Amino acid sequence: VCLFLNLANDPTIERIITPRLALTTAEFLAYQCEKHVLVILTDMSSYAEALREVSAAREEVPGRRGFPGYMYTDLATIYERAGRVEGRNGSITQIPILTMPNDDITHPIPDLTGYITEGQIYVDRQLHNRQIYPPINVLPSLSRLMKSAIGEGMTRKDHADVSNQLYACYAIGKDVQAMKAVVGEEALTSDDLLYLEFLQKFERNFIAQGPYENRTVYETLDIGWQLLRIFPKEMLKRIPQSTLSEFYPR
């Protein structure tokens, strides 16, 4: 770990050269020393509050919502220092963590980030007040290149189907949980009573993890089958039968 702090009582010009220092060394470790580098740029909403501060020191007129006009170029000069190259074994991937104000996606900080980055992960207040750690809801979250990342030679060949089936059973189990309050616990069928028992086990065994439990990618999928085994098959319609026969019976 190469750790770069920058406190709030530090100079606000040093917040600008902090992701430029961290990505210069991450371009020395990756594709100059050939090691796979993860760059975690936390509080990317406090970077662009320092970019707005020095933009008023150079006597510029503030653009949209106070932020400068060149913020799409300035954010993309520290995001696009990523990816793999052709002749070297190194790679560099970024997780730029930002706090959108007032849970707004139309703010210029998460809107000019969603234009250049490749899928988002939502930490939401709904699951956080419910005391679920980590409070990551997977219904609006998306990884645009997860169809490339998983596979047979990469993790194992059932990752594409157990991710689609856990996501489809989560949308139904959240939909029928709105039926439990206006219809009743009795009048719903035997199918919708199985999605409600999936919901209380998905958000407590799969998502709810604890801050010191290091689950591998294989221990994640094995929990992903213990929640799909409480359904009978032919409800698991997103999983093909070529992969349903090997991993279901246990």
Partner: protein, 212 residues
């Protein structure tokens, strides 16, 4: 049709008032669907038990034809001797999706006013005519339990399908074009601030061209 003043906190108030009415349809679409699901299977239980009483009332009217063959004509003794009823009904309540339905359940406070009817001629064709029509009353009260819940269900569907269409067509198209007015009016407060700041940076440059 707009409501209030654009102030950048009215944009997040109205986005929550839009959030209340966006989930006000999807909470009331399924309530109007749970009422429609029971409405479409009660109607199957109605028509199936209009063809079931078509053969029960055929057997019961033929059992009266067997009883007049044996014991004369008792159509003036039976009609005259009514004093108190034996089979009554009590109104029960049952509900689907929070809307109560009046249903009927029959009970017998049994003292027979026709215990002696015939008794020297007949009496065996009677008390099997009484069984073939008490069985028809036990059926026709279960049909009347499905008639009073049928006509009170589509009374509570029209008050729900109107309240769903009052949100999708009057309340939400008034909010989503109120929110369209906040954004176009908050863009004009930014250009007026843009024109006032560029006016000053043109004036500060001229004063810095004199002091050279």
């Amino acid at each position: 049709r707009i409501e209030i003043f654009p102030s950048r906190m009215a944009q997040t108030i109205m986005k929550a008032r839009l959030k209340g009415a966006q989930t006000g349809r999807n909470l009331l679409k399924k309530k109007s669907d749970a009422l429609t699901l029971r409405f479409r299977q009660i109607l199957k239980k109605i028509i199936e038990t209009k063809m079931l009483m078509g053969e029960v009332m055929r057997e019961a009217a033929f059992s009266l034809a067997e009883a007049k063959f044996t014991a004369g004509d008792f159509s003036t003794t039976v009609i005259q001797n009514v004093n108190k009823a034996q089979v009554k009904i009590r109104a029960k309540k049952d509900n689907v999706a929070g809307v109560t339905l009046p249903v009927f359940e029959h009970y017998h406070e049994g003292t027979d006013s026709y215990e002696l009817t015939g008794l020297a001629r007949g009496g065996e064709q009677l008390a099997k005519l009484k069984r073939n029509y008490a069985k028809a009353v036990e059926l026709l009260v279960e049909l009347a339990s499905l008639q009073t819940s049928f006509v009170t269900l589509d009374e509570a569907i029209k008050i729900t399908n109107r309240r769903v269409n009052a949100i999708e067509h009057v309340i939400i198209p008034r909010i989503e074009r109120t929110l369209a007015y906040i954004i176009t009016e908050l863009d004009e407060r930014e250009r007026e601030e843009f024109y006032r700041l560029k006016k000053i940076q043109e004036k500060k440059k001229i004063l810095k061209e004199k002091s050279d």
